Design a protein around this ligand. Structure first.
Ligand code: SF4
Length: 64
């Protein structure tokens, strides 16, 4: 159906998204950045709001 995720590649180090989704997004030591590991940790309204909170928006939904 509809998916999504991020590329901690363009993630500076702010928890802006992590807050709008302290369950799906969360920076790590391997990616020393926030990564959408748990898509269920953030609802579309939450995961989304957090995505709009990012400065560069290093996140992208995955349809396929
Ligand atoms: S909102 Fe954007 S810059 Fe801040 S941790 Fe999440 S991915 Fe990183």
């Amino acid at each position: 159906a509809r998916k999504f995720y991020v590329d901690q590649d363009e993630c500076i180090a702010c928890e802006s998204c992590v807050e709008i989704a302290p369950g799906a997004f969360a920076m790590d030591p391997e990616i020393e950045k926030a990564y959408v590991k748990d898509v269920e940790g953030a609802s579309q309204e939450e995961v989304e709001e957090a995505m709009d909170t990012c400065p560069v928006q290093c996140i992208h939904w995955e349809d396929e």
